[PDB]
Amino acid sequence: STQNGRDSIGRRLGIKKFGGEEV
Amino acid sequence: TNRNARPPKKANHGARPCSSVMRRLKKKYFYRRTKEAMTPEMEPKKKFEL
Amino acid sequence: MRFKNLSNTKQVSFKLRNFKKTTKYRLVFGNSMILLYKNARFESIYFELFRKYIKVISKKKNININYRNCWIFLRMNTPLTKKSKNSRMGKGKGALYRWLVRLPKHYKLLEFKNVNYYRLNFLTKKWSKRLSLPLAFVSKANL
RNA sequence: AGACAGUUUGACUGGGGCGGUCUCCUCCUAAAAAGUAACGGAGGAGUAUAAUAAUUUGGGGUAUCUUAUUUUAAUUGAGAUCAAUAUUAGAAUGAAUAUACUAAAUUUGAUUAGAGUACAAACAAGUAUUCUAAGGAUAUAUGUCUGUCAUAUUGACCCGAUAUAAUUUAGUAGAAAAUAUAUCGAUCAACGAAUAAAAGGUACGCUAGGGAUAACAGGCUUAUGGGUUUUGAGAGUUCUUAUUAAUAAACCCGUUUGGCACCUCGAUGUCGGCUCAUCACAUCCUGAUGGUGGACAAUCUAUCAAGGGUCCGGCUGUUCGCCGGUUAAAGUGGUACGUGAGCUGGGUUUAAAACGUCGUGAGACAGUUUGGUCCCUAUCUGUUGUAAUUACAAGAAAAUAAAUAAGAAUUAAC
RNA sequence: AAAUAUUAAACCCCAGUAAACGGCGGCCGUAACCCUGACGGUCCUAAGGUAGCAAAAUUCCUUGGCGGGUAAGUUCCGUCCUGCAUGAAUGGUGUAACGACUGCUCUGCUGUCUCCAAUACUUGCUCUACGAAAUUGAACUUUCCGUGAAGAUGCGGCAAUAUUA
RNA sequence: ACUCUUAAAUGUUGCAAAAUUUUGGGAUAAAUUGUAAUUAGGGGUGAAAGGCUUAUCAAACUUAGUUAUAGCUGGUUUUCCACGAAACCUAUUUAAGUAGGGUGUUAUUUUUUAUAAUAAUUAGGUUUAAAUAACUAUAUCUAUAAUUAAUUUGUUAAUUAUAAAAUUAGUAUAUAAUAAUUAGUUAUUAUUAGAUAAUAACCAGACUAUUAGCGCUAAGGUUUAUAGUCAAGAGAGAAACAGCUCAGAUUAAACAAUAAGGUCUUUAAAAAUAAAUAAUUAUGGAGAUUAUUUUUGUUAAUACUAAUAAGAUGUAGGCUUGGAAGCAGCCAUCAUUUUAAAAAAGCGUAAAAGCUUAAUAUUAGAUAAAUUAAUGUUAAAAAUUAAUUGAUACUUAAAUAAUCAUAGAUGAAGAGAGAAUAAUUUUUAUUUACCGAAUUGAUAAAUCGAAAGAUGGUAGUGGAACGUUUUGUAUAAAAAAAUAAAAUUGUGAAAU
Numbered sequence A: 001s002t003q004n005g006r007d008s009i010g011r012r013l014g015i016k017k018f019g020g021e022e023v
Numbered sequence B: 001t002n003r004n005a006r007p008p009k010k011a012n013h014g015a016r017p018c019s020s021v022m023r024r025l026k027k028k029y030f031y032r033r034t035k036e037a038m039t040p041e042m043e044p045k046k047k048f049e050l
Numbered sequence C: 001m002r003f004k005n006l007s008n009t010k011q012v013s014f015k016l017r018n019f020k021k022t023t024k025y026r027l028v029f030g031n032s033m034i035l036l037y038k039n040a041r042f043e044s045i046y047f048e049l050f051r052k053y054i055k056v057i058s059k060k061k062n063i064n065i066n067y068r069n070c071w072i073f074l075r076m077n078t079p080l081t082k083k084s085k086n087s088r089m090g091k092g093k094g095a096l097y098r099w100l101v102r103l104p105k106h107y108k109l110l111e112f113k114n115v116n117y118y119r120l121n122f123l124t125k126k127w128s129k130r131l132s133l134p135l136a137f138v139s140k141a142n143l
Numbered sequence D: 001a002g003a004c005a006g007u008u009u010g011a012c013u014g015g016g017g018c019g020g021u022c023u024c025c026u027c028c029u030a031a032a033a034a035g036u037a038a039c040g041g042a043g044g045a046g047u048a049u050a051a052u053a054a055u056u057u058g059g060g061g062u063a064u065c066u067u068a069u070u071u072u073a074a075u076u077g078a079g080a081u082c083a084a085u086a087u088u089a090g091a092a093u094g095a096a097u098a099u100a101c102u103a104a105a106u107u108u109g110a111u112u113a114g115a116g117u118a119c120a121a122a123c124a125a126g127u128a129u130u131c132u133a134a135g136g137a138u139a140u141a142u143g144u145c146u147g148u149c150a151u152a153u154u155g156a157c158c159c160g161a162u163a164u165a166a167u168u169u170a171g172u173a174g175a176a177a178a179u180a181u182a183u184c185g186a187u188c189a190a191c192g193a194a195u196a197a198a199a200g201g202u203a204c205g206c207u208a209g210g211g212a213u214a215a216c217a218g219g220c221u222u223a224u225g226g227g228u229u230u231u232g233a234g235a236g237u238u239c240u241u242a243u244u245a246a247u248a249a250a251c252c253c254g255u256u257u258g259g260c261a262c263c264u265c266g267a268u269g270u271c272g273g274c275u276c277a278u279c280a281c282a283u284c285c286u287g288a289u290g291g292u293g294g295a296c297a298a299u300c301u302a303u304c305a306a307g308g309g310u311c312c313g314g315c316u317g318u319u320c321g322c323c324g325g326u327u328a329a330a331g332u333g334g335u336a337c338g339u340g341a342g343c344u345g346g347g348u349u350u351a352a353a354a355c356g357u358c359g360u361g362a363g364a365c366a367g368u369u370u371g372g373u374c375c376c377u378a379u380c381u382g383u384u385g386u387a388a389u390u391a392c393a394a395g396a397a398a399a400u401a402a403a404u405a406a407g408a409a410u411u412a413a414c
Numbered sequence E: 001a002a003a004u005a006u007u008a009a010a011c012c013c014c015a016g017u018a019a020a021c022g023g024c025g026g027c028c029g030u031a032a033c034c035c036u037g038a039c040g041g042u043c044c045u046a047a048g049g050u051a052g053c054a055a056a057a058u059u060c061c062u063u064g065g066c067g068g069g070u071a072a073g074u075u076c077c078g079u080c081c082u083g084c085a086u087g088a089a090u091g092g093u094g095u096a097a098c099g100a101c102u103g104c105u106c107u108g109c110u111g112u113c114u115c116c117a118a119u120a121c122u123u124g125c126u127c128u129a130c131g132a133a134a135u136u137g138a139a140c141u142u143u144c145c146g147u148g149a150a151g152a153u154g155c156g157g158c159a160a161u162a163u164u165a
Numbered sequence F: 001a002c003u004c005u006u007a008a009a010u011g012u013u014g015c016a017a018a019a020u021u022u023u024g025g026g027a028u029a030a031a032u033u034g035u036a037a038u039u040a041g042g043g044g045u046g047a048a049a050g051g052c053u054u055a056u057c058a059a060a061c062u063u064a065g066u067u068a069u070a071g072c073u074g075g076u077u078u079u080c081c082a083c084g085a086a087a088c089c090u091a092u093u094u095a096a097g098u099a100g101g102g103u104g105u106u107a108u109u110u111u112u113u114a115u116a117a118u119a120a121u122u123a124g125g126u127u128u129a130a131a132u133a134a135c136u137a138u139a140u141c142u143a144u145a146a147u148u149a150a151u152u153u154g155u156u157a158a159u160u161a162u163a164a165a166a167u168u169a170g171u172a173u174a175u176a177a178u179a180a181u182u183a184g185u186u187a188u189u190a191u192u193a194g195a196u197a198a199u200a201a202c203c204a205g206a207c208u209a210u211u212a213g214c215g216c217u218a219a220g221g222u223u224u225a226u227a228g229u230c231a232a233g234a235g236a237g238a239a240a241c242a243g244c245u246c247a248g249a250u251u252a253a254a255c256a257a258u259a260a261g262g263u264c265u266u267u268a269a270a271a272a273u274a275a276a277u278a279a280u281u282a283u284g285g286a287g288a289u290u291a292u293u294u295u296u297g298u299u300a301a302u303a304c305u306a307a308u309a310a311g312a313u314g315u316a317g318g319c320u321u322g323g324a325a326g327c328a329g330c331c332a333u334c335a336u337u338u339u340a341a342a343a344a345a346g347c348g349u350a351a352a353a354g355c356u357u358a359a360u361a362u363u364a365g366a367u368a369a370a371u372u373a374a375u376g377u378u379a380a381a382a383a384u385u386a387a388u389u390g391a392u393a394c395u396u397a398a399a400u401a402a403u404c405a406u407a408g409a410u411g412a413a414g415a416g417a418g419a420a421u422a423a424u425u426u427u428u429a430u431u432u433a434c435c436g437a438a439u440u441g442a443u444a445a446a447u448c449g450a451a452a453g454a455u456g457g458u459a460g461u462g463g464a465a466c467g468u469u470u471u472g473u474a475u476a477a478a479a480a481a482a483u484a485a486a487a488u489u490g491u492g493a494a495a496u
C-alpha cells in the first residue's frame, strides 16, 4: 500500500532572452 | 549459457554486450556488502562516547 | 533523512548508489589520532567491541586529569531499510531494521591527547583485522 | 411480480484478484538553461475576504539581549548584536526589507468597450500586460489603481434558466419561438466528461488470441540456506584452539524458503511407490594415519581414500517422521526434486452428493468426506544381441601372440 | 394556461404470522488454597443455544488426553470436553431387518509376496498370396564439455565409425 | 430364460464411433416386451443426474437474413533503379487500438526560419569548499561580579555564573558565495538544405559506456537522463556470440599500402639487446609462509657468533591472606655487594624450591669504510663544532615476486588444443619490421552528376520496364503455337 505519487508538472520558468539578444 | 559472467578479453575492450561483471568489480573500493544477522540497534540518538 | 524530528517522524533516505568523498585530514585538538582510509558504512558494533579497551588506556584508577583525552564526532546517518522474505517488488519501500554511519575516506574517528603510542598501534591493527577495513594511526612525532 | 425478456457489470497494476489510486498545486529525484518516469519519498487543495481591496498621510525600522525610567511606554529613552531573522491568510519552495506590522482620512479600478504582441503549447485550454476610447476615485500630483506578494483554491459542449445595451421571414401583422450581450446550475471526483438512465456467479461451460502474462520444471540472482576459512565472549582443575565456540570477517557451492518473467500456451502433466539405474564426495561402516585431558578397552576430533557395501516390518496417500526389532553400517545429495511414448493412479486440480462456515441469491473454500477414463504397430539417434557383403597381405585351410578396453562381491562372529 | 377542493387500488404507519425464513449475550465479585462458581448484583437484548448428542461425513492448533486391540497402529472401537465454525421437520437422539455402499478386525484359504520355475494353445519369427493408418521442411541423421532465444545429432573445440540389414 | 451392468483383466487407428470373457444385482412385479400412435425447441418429457430428444443438447436439426461481425491470428503472386524512418511526448472505458505533434518520401518556389566545427558572450547555483547561515550534536577560553566549609577566620582549602573572544563532524528534500561541459544569441569558415503543400509508416523496444531512483548499490532485474550500436548493417577481431572494438559493401577481377588484432606448431606473419619467475607457469580474495629490495631512529663497539660460567643482596619489602617467600591482588620501585644482574619482561610451586630472558664477563673468530663546509700563521707537557652516505645488530615498518588459501554431480571442461623453462614461444622494458577487412589507392563497366564525387537498407514513398488475356491497326500479310535440350543477347524479369 502506497499513498504517495501525485506530483505536479514542471513550470516553464527562467530567462527566455539572454544578454546581447534582440528585443 | 551464463553470458552474464563471461569476462571480456583484450579485443573486447573492457566490455561484452550482456556482461554484468565489470560493473560489479568497480565497487570494491567504495562499497562493502552487508548482512542481516547483526545486533539490532535502533536508537539514532545514540551516544558513541566512552 | 531529516534531523528535525528524529523520534517522532518516520524516516526514509535514499540509498546512494555511488557516493564517494574525501575530506582532508588534519589534527586540531590533540597529538595522535586514528583515521579511516576507505569509504565505508561504519556500524555501531564496530565500536562497542573495542570500547572497553580504549577506557583501559585513556582512563585509569586513582589518576585525575583536568584536560580531555578523546574527541568523538560520530552520529548515525543511514537507516538501511529492507523488505520481507516473500514480498514481490513494487508496492512501496521496505522497512527498518538497523541504523549506520556513512563515513568518508579520510575521517578522524578519534583524536587523542597524550595517550600511549605503543598500545594504539597494537589496537588499530586488531581493530582493522576484525573489520577488514584499512585503518591508520598517526602521531605528531612521525609527522 | 426475475414470472418472462433485452443489456451493462471501468482502467492502471511487476500474473490476476483482495487493498489502494484516477483531476489540480510545491519541493527532492532532476545530473548549475527548460523538460525528465516509476504502486519512489513527503505534505497539501476542492477555500477565505466588501475589507484582508484602491489612492494619499503619519509612526517606530522589525527581531535578539542587557540597562535605566515623575512605574510609565499609541509603538518610551539609551547601548550592543543580527552570511536577513521577524513576519508576509492556509502546504512547500522561491522572493521581498520603499518588505511586513500598526493608526487614520477620503473611496469602490473587485468599471464598460475595441485592437495586438510575447511566453507556453499536439489540439482545445491556460498565463503576464502594454497601446487606443468612454466614464470615475486619489489630490502638489509630475503621477498612481483594470481585486489580494506569487504559484492550487476547480469542469468542456449540449439541454435549460433570470435579467437585458439587439434583430427577426413557416402567406401578412402580432403572440409563440430561436439567436445575441451580461450571468447562474454537477464529488459528470473514472475530473478531455462514451448514456438522463446499470450489480454478480459459472466445479456445465464455449470461441478467438498470448509464452505481449501466471503455477511444476529449466535459466540468471543467492537476501535466506548449507559448508570451508580467519578472529576467539565464554565453558573445559590451570589453560583461547584435546574437545568446545559466541561475535565480527574473507571466499565457495547451487540441494531449501523466495525475487525476476529470457525459452515453451498450434495435445500433457503433480508428489509418492514397483522395476531399472548412473554420477559426485562435502565418507555412515570397512581400510591407512596424525593428535588426545589416549593406561587397556569403548570413544571424541582432523586428514588421505569412492574399491565393494549400505535392511525387513506396523500406522499414514506419503517422501519424511514416531514406534518395535536388528545390523560391520542402516550416508548427504544431483540426474525435467532421474525414471508415466516402461507399469501403477492411492493423494491433489473437473462433472454427481453431503456436513460445517461465509453469502439476499446463483454459488464459493491454501476446509472435510464417499465415488470417479486419455491412446500408440518405433523412421532416425542410442543400446542388448545375431549375421551378411567387402578389404588387407600372392591365393587358401588352421592355430597363437601383441595392444587397448571391460569385468572382478563386501563383512566377520566364533 | 396555471392553481386549490373532491377521490380508487397500491405504498407507508399499525396488527398478525415462527413444522416460514432467520436469530439465541456479556461484565464484576462471591464458598476452611489459587483456580473452580450454585448464588448475588451489574449493562444490554425481540429473546439469550433448553433437552440431547459431541475430535463427529461438522475439530484450525491435532497423530488432542486416558484405556482397548497389535511384537509395534496418524486409520478403527469405547470415553472425557474451550463444540475455532453442533443443535431439533435444511428436522435432534436411538433403532431389529435390507444393502453389488464406506471404514477397521479375526479364522480358514491361497503364487498376491519371500522367488519365481516348467508346460499347452494363441500371438510372434521364416517362406508364400493379398495389403492399411496417423505422421513427414529437406537429410549423406555420432559421444562429451563449452556455446548460445538461456537443456544442441547440425556452431566451436579434442576425438569416434569399413559399409548396411 | 429375460432384463439391468457392480468388480477386474483384455481392447483403445479395437470384433465394436462404448464390445468380448469371467463375476455379480432383480427375477408375481413401482416388472419385461412386441405392434400402431400421441407429447416437440427456452418448449417437450423428466421416480431430478443439468439427463434424454436419430452417434449431435446451459437450449436440436435444415434452410434463410448472410459473403454475419472481428481494434484478433493466419496469408497477400514478376524485375531493376534511387532516397530512407519509428519504437518518444500528449489525450483516450485507453493500454497488443487510434488520433495530432516529431521523424520519412515526392512535388513546387528569384529558395537558410538550417546542420556541424572554432571563437567571443550572457544567466545559472550541480559541483568545489581548512567555506558554515539553518537543523541535529559538540570541545574550549575570560575581564567583571560573587559563593561554601573550618578558628591554622589580619589565614588555609575547595569552588560557581557571565559581556567580548571561540573549535569540530554530519545531511537526498543545507547553502551568502562559486567550476568545466551542455543550452540561448552574434560573428567566421565549410557543407547543403530550409519553408509551404499533398501524404504513408511508427507509438511492445534491447544491450553497452556514464549517471541516478525501488531492489541483498543481487538479478541478462525494473524506471528516467546523455551518447553509441543492433533494430533496419554484411566483412575482419573476440575459440563459437544480433547489442563490445576496427569499419560503413554499387558490381567486377590471381595488384599494392593499412585499421583493432596477432607472429613457437595447429594459424598466414619477426628477430635482436638487457632483465623477472622455476610454479605440471594464464586468472585475481581477508590472510599466511619464503625470498628480495627500500625505509624510520631520544639506539650502539662491551656490535655480532659460538663454547663454558654467572644471573646475586638488604628482602620472605610493607599490607592483605587458610597460605602470598621477586612473580593471586593493593601501595611502593628504594638501596647495597658485584666486572654486570629488573622489589623483576615470563614459565614454574598448595606456598616453597627449581628454569629462562634484560644487563655482563673470560677466550677465539670477527664488522667499523668513504666524504662535505670553516678564522692567512701561531694556544699547547692537553682539548675541536654543524652534517651526510654506507657494512653489522636492535628498532620503525612498508613494497615487489612466486606458492598455498577444498570442491561438486554424463567426461580434462580451466587457459581453444598440444607444448614450451625463454635459445624464433609465457611475463616486463627499449629497438627495428611484417602478416591483416568487401577500408583506402590503382584497372574495367553501368546509372545520377559539368566536374569532384555519390549508389548498404526493413516498414515505407517515388521512377523505369518484362510477361499474360481481350479488342482495334488487319478489306492487310501468313503458319510466329505447345514440349525438351543446347546456343545467343540482356543489369534482370524474360526474349530469339
Ligand SMILES: [Mg+2]
Pocket (backbone or CB within 6 Å): A005, A006, A007
Ligand atoms: Mg511521477
Ligand SMILES: [Mg+2]
Pocket (backbone or CB within 6 Å): A008, A009, A010, A011
Ligand atoms: Mg515541480
Ligand SMILES: [Mg+2]
Pocket (backbone or CB within 6 Å): none
Ligand atoms: Mg435476466
Ligand SMILES: [Mg+2]
Pocket (backbone or CB within 6 Å): none
Ligand atoms: Mg425490475
Ligand SMILES: [Mg+2]
Pocket (backbone or CB within 6 Å): none
Ligand atoms: Mg446485442
Ligand SMILES: [Mg+2]
Pocket (backbone or CB within 6 Å): none
Ligand atoms: Mg486489467
Ligand SMILES: [Mg+2]
Pocket (backbone or CB within 6 Å): none
Ligand atoms: Mg500482481
Ligand SMILES: [Mg+2]
Pocket (backbone or CB within 6 Å): none
Ligand atoms: Mg535542470
Ligand SMILES: [Mg+2]
Pocket (backbone or CB within 6 Å): D031
Ligand atoms: Mg548528484
Ligand SMILES: [Mg+2]
Pocket (backbone or CB within 6 Å): D037
Ligand atoms: Mg518518459
Ligand SMILES: [Mg+2]
Pocket (backbone or CB within 6 Å): none
Ligand atoms: Mg490528499
Ligand SMILES: [Mg+2]
Pocket (backbone or CB within 6 Å): none
Ligand atoms: Mg496584506
Ligand SMILES: [Mg+2]
Pocket (backbone or CB within 6 Å): none
Ligand atoms: Mg507607510
Ligand SMILES: [Mg+2]
Pocket (backbone or CB within 6 Å): none
Ligand atoms: Mg531600542
Ligand SMILES: [Mg+2]
Pocket (backbone or CB within 6 Å): none
Ligand atoms: Mg498566499
Ligand SMILES: [Mg+2]
Pocket (backbone or CB within 6 Å): none
Ligand atoms: Mg510559508
